């Protein structure tokens, strides 16, 4: 069906590979300054909307923070995820 995703994640976790991907992504985002950019954006958005309500603030921040990920980080980590999936999935 479409529990493919959840079964692939289970494999990635159990094999040790999810940890690798997760840490690699975090190390890259941190070093390129994206973590601190998202924190700035968040503060700025709280000021703008005069609110600390999480649901409201997230709806303005998340779309922008997704787009702020550098091309290099995004396409490197996607390639690294594909390569792990190439080992375990059949295609047609």
């Amino acid at each position: 069906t479409a529990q493919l995703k959840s079964q692939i994640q289970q494999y990635l976790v159990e094999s040790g590979n999810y940890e690798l991907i997760s840490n690699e992504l975090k190390a890259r985002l941190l070093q390129e300054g994206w973590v601190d950019k998202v924190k700035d954006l968040t503060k700025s958005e709280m000021n703008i909307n005069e609110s600390t309500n999480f649901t409201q603030i997230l709806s303005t921040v998340e779309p922008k923070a997704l787009e702020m990920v550098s091309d290099s980080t995004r396409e490197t980590v996607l390639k690294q995820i594909r390569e792990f999936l190439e080992e375990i999935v059949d295609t047609q």
Partner: protein, 437 residues
């Protein structure tokens, strides 16, 4: 205009047995999150019980049952509606969400400070929240005169998370055998912390005057780096004096010290000799450090200065070799001196004023002896020198939570953007461990 509290948890807390149940469960959830290995943590706290996805946004751990549910497909929200359990703990950060308010509960001290639940009446009556003005410890130190080599260093210590935790934990205070801030350096440093963060013509200079008084009693030069070394040695000496069994601990461990200095700032360098033929590491010598002094001549970047510090120098049959310096053990806080002051043989002094670019996050993997994983430090402090080796002036810049930088120029404390901070001529850099893969 007044900010309000989640009305739902307030209602729950009208019953004291319920309040205690909530606080027990919050403590339990947080404990588990700090005591689960990464795989367990993914499979058991970050896996949605409805869709079974890992990290479908935040995953929340229910207060009232064992269910975990995701954000992105609104599965915890469905649980709160279906079953009536409206509270869950985010398994990334331990924060408590009200799914009726659609917000976190972040402004109740009891829940934030839940580990003291059993003592909360005593805590509440006998302590208060920091005052607005002192909450970040920001205050200037007057130049009293040619004392900016001391005050610049003190601002970096006072804004260092490890020292501030040490001091506020009362560890020195509980054990000190002198108990007087005009004699004990460590007691003087505690007094400065007291003044800057708590409550004890000019203001908030008392602890600093005490320290000068202590300094004198040892006895009174020019160099902020030398005062850094002086002051960390005093903190160590005071730990050793306060032990019951200093002789014995040294014999047993010897050359391991458990003081705040030696468990935070100390690493070690490995000096090695290696056969070019086969790469047999024949011979290593390990030596401790409290900071790394780097040559900057003809360089533009901090990573070039480290590359130079780390460079290779000068089977059948291993001794007829190459020498290399690398890091054997890293410290929790890495401190870097960029060597800028020359003292020539004719008694004259020269200042190297070269700009050296230094990063907000520093990866030390390429400098550790040995594949080395990413080991990434966050820049939190800079001391800058301006002018001549002897007739010059030190300023400190410290980063606090949220990422604002502050400039400390004697009594003047000002806000400064990161862009401007990164253009400073760094003399000392203070880096704190942030991520280890």
């Amino acid at each position: 205009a007044a900010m309000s509290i989640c009305p739902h948890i307030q209602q729950v807390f009208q019953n004291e047995k319920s309040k205690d149940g909530v606080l027990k469960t919050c403590n339990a959830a947080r404990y588990i999150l700090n005591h689960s290995v990464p795989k367990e943590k993914f499979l058991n706290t970050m896996k949605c019980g409805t869709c079974h996805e890992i990290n479908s946004g935040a995953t929340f751990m229910c207060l009232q049952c064992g269910f975990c549910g995701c954000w992105n497909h609104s599965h915890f929200l469905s649980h709160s509606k279906q079953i009536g359990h409206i509270f869950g703990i985010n398994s990334n950060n331990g924060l408590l969400f009200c799914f009726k308010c659609e917000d976190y509960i972040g402004n109740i001290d009891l829940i934030n400070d839940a580990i003291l639940a059993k003592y909360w009446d005593d805590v509440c009556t006998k302590t208060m929240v920091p005052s607005m003005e002192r909450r970040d410890g920001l205050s200037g130190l007057i130049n009293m005169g040619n004392t900016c080599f001391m005050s610049s260093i003190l601002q970096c210590l006072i804004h260092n998370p490890y020292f501030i935790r040490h001091s506020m934990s009362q560890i020195h205070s509980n054990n000190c055998k002198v108990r007087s801030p005009d004699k004990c350096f460590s007691c003087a440093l505690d007094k400065i912390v007291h003044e800057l963060y708590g409550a004890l013509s000019t203001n908030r200079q008392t602890g600093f005057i005490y320290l000068l008084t202590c300094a004198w009693k040892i006895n009174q030069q020019q160099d902020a780096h030398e005062f850094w070394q002086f002051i960390i040695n005093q903190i160590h000496q005071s730990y050793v004096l306060d032990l019951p069994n200093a002789k014995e601990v040294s014999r047993a461990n010897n050359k391991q010290c458990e003081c705040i200095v030696h468990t935070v700032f100390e690493g070690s360098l490995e000096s090695s000799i290696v056969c070019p033929g086969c790469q047999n590491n024949s011979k290593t010598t390990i030596d401790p450090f409290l900071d790394l002094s780097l040559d900057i001549k003809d360089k533009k970047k901090l990573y070039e200065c480290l590359d130079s510090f780390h460079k290779k120098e000068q089977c059948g049959e291993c001794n007829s070799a190459i020498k290399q310096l690398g890091i054997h053990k890293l410290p929790s806080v890495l401190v870097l001196q960029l060597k800028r002051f020359e003292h020539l043989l004719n008694g004259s002094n020269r200042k190297l004023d070269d700009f050296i670019e230094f990063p907000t996050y520093l990866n030390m993997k390429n400098y550790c002896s040995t594949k080395v994983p990413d080991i990434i430090y966050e820049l939190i402090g800079i001391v800058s020198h301006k002018g001549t080796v002897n007739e010059g002036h030190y300023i400190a810049f410290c980063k606090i939570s949220g990422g604002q930088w502050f400039k400390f120029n004697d009594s003047m404390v000002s806000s400064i953007s990161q862009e401007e901070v990164l253009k400073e001529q760094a003399y000392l850099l203070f880096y704190t461990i942030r991520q280890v893969n």
